Amino acid sequence: QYQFWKNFQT
């Protein structure tokens, strides 16, 4: 539910 922020932040 949060990987969307992880995979994009970089």
Q: How far apart are CA 5 and CA 1, in angstroms?
A: 9
The structure tokens 């992880």 sit at: 6
5: three-class secondary structure by DSSP? helix
Q: How far apart are CA 8 and CA 1, in angstroms?
A: 13
Task: Classify residue 1 as exposed, middle or buried by CB count within 10 Å of its CB (0-12, 13-18, 19+).
Answer: exposed
2: three-class secondary structure by DSSP? coil
Tokens representing 7 are: 């995979």
Q: How far apart are CA 1 and CA 7, in angstroms?
A: 12
- CA 8 to chain centroid, in Å, comes to 5
